[PDB]
From a paper:
D-Glyceraldehyde-3-phosphate dehydrogenase (GAPDH, E.C. 1.2.1.12) catalyzes the sixth glycolytic reaction. GAPDH shares an evolutionarily conserved fold consisting in two juxtaposed domains, an N-terminal NAD-binding domain (NBD) and a C-terminal catalytic domain. The active site of GAPDH contains also two structurally distinct phosphate-binding sites, the Pi and Ps sites, where inorganic phosphate and the phosphate group from the glyceraldehyde-3-phosphate (G3P) substrate bind, respectively, during reaction.
We have determined the first crystal structures of SpGAPDH at 1.50 Å resolution and CpGAPDH at 2.55 Å resolution. Likewise, for SpGAPDH, Arg235 interacts with Thr182, Asp184, and Gln185. Comparing the adenine-binding subsites of AvGAPDH with SpGAPDH, there are two important substitutions: Ala95 to Arg (although the interaction with NAD+ occurs through main-chain hydrogen bonds) and, analogously to CpGAPDH, Tyr117 is a Phe in SpGAPDH. Furthermore, in SpGAPDH a Gly residue substitutes Lys210 of AvGAPDH, completely eliminating the positive charge. The three GAPDH enzymes exhibited roughly similar values for the kinetic parameters except for kcat (and kcat/KM), which was significantly greater for SpGAPDH. Anacardic acid inhibited GAPDH through a non-competitive mechanism with respect to both G3P and NAD+ substrates. While curcumin is an uncompetitive inhibitor with respect to G3P for SpGAPDH and AvGAPDH, it behaves as a non-competitive inhibitor with respect to NAD+.
Author numbering:
A (entry chain B), B (entry chain A), C (entry chain A), D (entry chain B): 1 to 336
Amino acid sequence: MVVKVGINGFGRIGRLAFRRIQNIEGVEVTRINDLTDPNMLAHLLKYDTTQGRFDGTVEVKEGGFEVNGNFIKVSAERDPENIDWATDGVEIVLEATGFFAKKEAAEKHLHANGAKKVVITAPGGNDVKTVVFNTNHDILDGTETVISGASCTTNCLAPMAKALHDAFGIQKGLMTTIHAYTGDQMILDGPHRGGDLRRARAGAANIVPNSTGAAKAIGLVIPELNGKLDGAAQRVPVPTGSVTELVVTLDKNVSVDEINAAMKAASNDSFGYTEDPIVSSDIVGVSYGSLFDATQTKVMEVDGSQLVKVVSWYDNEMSYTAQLVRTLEYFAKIAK
Amino acid sequence: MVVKVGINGFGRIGRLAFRRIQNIEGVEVTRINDLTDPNMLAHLLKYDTTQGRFDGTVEVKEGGFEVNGNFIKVSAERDPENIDWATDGVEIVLEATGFFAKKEAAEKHLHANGAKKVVITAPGGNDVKTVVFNTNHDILDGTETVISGASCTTNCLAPMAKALHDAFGIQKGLMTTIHAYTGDQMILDGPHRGGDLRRARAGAANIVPNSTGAAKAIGLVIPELNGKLDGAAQRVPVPTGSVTELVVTLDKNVSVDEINAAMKAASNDSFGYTEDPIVSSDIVGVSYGSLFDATQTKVMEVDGSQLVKVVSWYDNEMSYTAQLVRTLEYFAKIAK
Amino acid sequence: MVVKVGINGFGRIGRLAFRRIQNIEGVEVTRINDLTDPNMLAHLLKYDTTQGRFDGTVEVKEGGFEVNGNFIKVSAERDPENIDWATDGVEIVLEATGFFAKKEAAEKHLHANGAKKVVITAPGGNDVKTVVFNTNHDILDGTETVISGASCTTNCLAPMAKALHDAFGIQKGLMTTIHAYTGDQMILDGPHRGGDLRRARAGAANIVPNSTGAAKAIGLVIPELNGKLDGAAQRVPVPTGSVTELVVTLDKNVSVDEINAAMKAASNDSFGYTEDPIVSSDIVGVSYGSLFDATQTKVMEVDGSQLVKVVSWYDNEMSYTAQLVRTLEYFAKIAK
Amino acid sequence: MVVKVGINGFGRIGRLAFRRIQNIEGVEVTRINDLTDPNMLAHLLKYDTTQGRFDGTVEVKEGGFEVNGNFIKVSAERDPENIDWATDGVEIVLEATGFFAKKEAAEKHLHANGAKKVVITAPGGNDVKTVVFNTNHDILDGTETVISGASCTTNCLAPMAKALHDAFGIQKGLMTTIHAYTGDQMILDGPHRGGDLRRARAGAANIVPNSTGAAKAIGLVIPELNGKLDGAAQRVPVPTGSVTELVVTLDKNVSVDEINAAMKAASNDSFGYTEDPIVSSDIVGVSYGSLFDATQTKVMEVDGSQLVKVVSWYDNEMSYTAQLVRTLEYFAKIAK
Ligand SMILES: NC(=O)c1ccc[n+]([C@@H]2O[C@H](COP(=O)([O-])OP(=O)(O)OC[C@H]3O[C@@H](n4cnc5c(N)ncnc54)[C@H](O)[C@@H]3O)[C@@H](O)[C@H]2O)c1
Ligand SMILES: NC(=O)c1ccc[n+]([C@@H]2O[C@H](COP(=O)([O-])OP(=O)(O)OC[C@H]3O[C@@H](n4cnc5c(N)ncnc54)[C@H](O)[C@@H]3O)[C@@H](O)[C@H]2O)c1
Ligand SMILES: NC(=O)c1ccc[n+]([C@@H]2O[C@H](COP(=O)([O-])OP(=O)(O)OC[C@H]3O[C@@H](n4cnc5c(N)ncnc54)[C@H](O)[C@@H]3O)[C@@H](O)[C@H]2O)c1
Ligand SMILES: NC(=O)c1ccc[n+]([C@@H]2O[C@H](COP(=O)([O-])OP(=O)(O)OC[C@H]3O[C@@H](n4cnc5c(N)ncnc54)[C@H](O)[C@@H]3O)[C@@H](O)[C@H]2O)c1
């Protein structure tokens, strides 16, 4: 009754997903594929700048490493169609490299003696179901071969936008996420391999504007909001931890207290609520996908009409990963 | 016809104001007051983490220091009433400590052996004239005893909001400034003397939400926008350099290109225009009070109505200081 | 038989000491004195940028706050003579403000309605007993009224220097500690109240040389090394976490392996040993006072004589605090 | 009388070398080769996080870009033997990619219709002359096909070690350089493509120990010191700017003043001298290869013998680049 999982890309999301999977019964990781040797991967699992020391033992072995005595095979195949996942019983692959985040590319894992299903740890295109756990995981039926866990920002934005929309009716909106720098930025100014003149700049030494598709693509998660939102990011020098601001007009006039109460009423394991005046370091490592912050709510009313601002925190690392593993765990129970 | 100026508070703004005044003919600094000895102040003028080495020579002397051979007297009086500005011929004081930023407090400089006029390098309350150079410096007549150079954020916001309002009619708006950390934050978590639970946190290690009065108080500079705007800040880990986002509804529907063209048409020495995809380090040390970034403009249109987003950069240090010294120079020329 | 403790200065060391005392049976904190209101102190206990969320509940009350339901009284007296420690049963005060770190100043806590004994959380001069737990806590007899827990650097240096000296005989040495920035540095360039032209500079944006008395003062802990060592610091942009390098000449020639084996043989709960290639974030929050890093050992031999380099990590916050509370617990158990 | 130069690798050193070459008469850059398009390279030349805006105009064109109206060809050939340098008149190549830093690899530029000589902007192996300008550029005769400009640390260490050795006789020494992070570190924890478990860690969020060969290889520059020194690095979170500490024993006993005077006597355009208590931001952009800091000198004397500590600053970017371009300019005059 345990589904065997493989991780392609033992990066920030891959390693934290591995960490969370150590505390759930329904799945286990039997194989990791990356581009390096087992000693590099074992060391990066054991020691983690932002998420702390690993909870357990890690011992490098020939061809893999042992976690609390259990051997995990490590391979270094650059091409997914060359990974023989089935040899190690792997049925579902977490595709966490950032290089195969579309249906046709992720399908490369599904070859003979490969895997059966793929969860992309990122937006995966419009022909792949895009799931924010506890907002729209109802759309899965288990027959899908490739699904998407969406982005960090989408998992933050979606429960907040859904709750506000259901209560008051979102007409239109603009989003800004103030976001930690990530591994797709350069450590120091240099050529960006994706052509982005702003991610080319030193990520820990600048406020860096950058594009994000979370608001424009929200219809994959909340169909009623298709075509109603847009937004962007300001990437700033913290190594993890982020926040999403959303400014909207609504069908109903509201008060600050009414907004905050509507968010609290929607709170659950994915969507948290706080009235404490926290800062970004306080959400590093949290398990909420989105933490609504009532201290930042604003309503600007002039001449009987309002602009409404709502703000939610997210650890783009652990908040996203908690949501990803919730979706993986659910998908594994229904996969067919 | 050269007006003698004193600086109270030889801090970030005080020292950079001194630097800019070295290239102005109409004013000269003859006296500095702070809380320390001349060697400390001379060293901090010569060496500057974010704004570079001083352009000239600085040499400590008895009771002050020489800048390019010219002696500047230094005193260390905590109470402005005890500063004998008149001994050094000072007529106008730049009040840059952060502790006397209101009319009655700034008037402490005005006494028999004191000065004649004060420019507060900060918001100064609603009963003193508040000037953003090249937006409303025509409200000065030279008879004022205390004026305000507004805040960094106000000098960024004002030319952008005025150009947008004049062209299209701002109905209501919300502002977020993503702002460099400043000296009123704690270097590491600890009790904040002002009672602010967020400025208590380590400023170079967090995204820190905090309040800002610039949007609400814009009516002191643009009277037609009184009651129309509000906003807040996200303080982030860069030691200087900031950006202001403004989301509004307007009386007229517009396009992105129409907005950008209206901003460019309003550009001058205070309000710059760029289409280059810059980041915060690129505006450190600039002399614009506000640098509009056309790459960040957005229009979100639903059902015939729009949200409009406009964004402008500012070096909260040198951009503000350039505006402050423009205002000081003008005020001194017409002073009576 | 539980000794009641007060904390003067609920700062980085004061708050982390409180956290560690929650897991010690022999002492309990009944009173905190600082300069602010209880809401500020409660918030700073609950949320901590570098050391994570508090393990328990914290709730503000009238005149203090409750920790896991237990009320802690809070006062705000700037002068230690005015703190009525005895009202709350306090016998031993942790003097953690940084402003009373000498015998006569710490004695201000000792009066009719005050405390009985003081532990200074810092060097306290050459006339108070200076204790590094598990190196020289046997010098205490419990009759002392004022003792010192030494500095962070001393607690790192002492077990390493003692093991090396006992095995091989230290003749002379120089120390460099590459140290996290601390609260006595300015967040941005500005006048330093202590007159230090380098701690005046932006602490999270520079490599900052600064003085350290730990090596010169080591004779208070290891008398045989009086007059043999000196050193200095390079303060760098991490908010906590530090490392001590020591270069010596010895009475005996040695090999790298011989040095490392001597360190490992001396390891205990205070002095750890590692061969993993860790970085500073890996020691944040550790409970060793000193963690020897065998990967950094060097022997430079020319013409039959050697320079020897040994290196040990320390979290200047939690490593020091773990040592401080070990000493407090021991001192309270034998106090008379 | 102008020698035409090509740059392979328009990175930190490549772009800053280009910037410095704009102010010297004897050489000009006619071709840049990297891995990207001209718009990326032009943008990175124009805007520079740590070294400021480019002094001039940059305009992208087809197949290259214009600098102050002069067209520079850009190509994107991954393999040096495929670059037809001679088509653009290039005689000397600055090999600044980091991927061809050995004689056999650098020689790939010297094929038919290629270049004539290569200067590696890094250590290049022991069969390549290794030059620190104004310390040993006398060893060049111009017949060499491949030479090395050494490392940043070597250019800092060498004039200081030479002056100390000539004056007093270095017996043995150990070096620690506290160094800015560089582009060979990961922005966030992840697999390091060189296998380095410490450069795998987030470079702007850690104190990172790492190896350096500058001390052990000093004999390539100062033959008398072969086999007498060793050392290592602590890489810390500043984006440029570094410092080198050296601890030695000498043939003569000395005083602090005697050491400082010997360094000042050796000062020139490459080796500067200061007594000001500066920090790392103060040496960003300087043109000295090495800036001796008299405030950090120490002499630890016990029982008639001494340990001696000397310390010099360097901008690992511009200090190294100034030295590199001095060597290039000299080599171009004598190349045959
Ligand atoms: N970091 C975040 O905040 C975050 C949040 C949500 C989603 N994501 C998404 O998750 C994915 C991974 O991001 P990350 O931050 O963990 O990146 P990362 O760079 O830390 O990890 C990528 C890993 O993939 C490996 N890799 C690269 N190419 C490979 C190949 N061909 N085969 C096997 N392994 C390969 C790398 O060696 C590395 O270990 C991306 O799609 C990203 O958009 C990231
Ligand atoms: N830094 C910015 O981005 C910025 C921008 C615009 C306006 N301002 C405003 O300018 C003022 C100064 O800000 P700053 O960032 O330069 O602060 P700062 O802390 O760098 O400088 C304040 C200076 O005042 C001195 N000082 C304090 N109390 C004093 C007293 N009683 N008498 C004499 N000197 C005293 C301090 O020693 C220090 O040198 C504030 O009102 C601030 O709001 C700051
Ligand atoms: N942070 C470290 O790495 C470290 C390590 C070892 C020792 N120490 C020592 O511990 C002491 C505290 O250092 P810290 O880093 O915790 O400093 P901190 O600035 O974080 O804390 C000092 C606290 O004392 C309070 N305070 C100041 N003056 C006071 C007064 N007159 N009465 C009551 N409270 C007052 C402040 O409000 C603050 O909460 C210093 O002696 C320091 O040298 C610090
Ligand atoms: N940054 C420093 O402090 C410093 C100091 C002294 C020496 N160096 C040395 O200079 C060299 C460059 O270092 P950097 O910091 O400028 O690195 P960098 O990463 O900034 O620049 C390397 C450049 O080379 C390009 N490149 C990579 N492979 C290539 C190929 N096959 N063909 C063409 N171009 C290619 C990259 O796109 C990039 O623009 C290294 O050898 C380094 O050790 C660096």
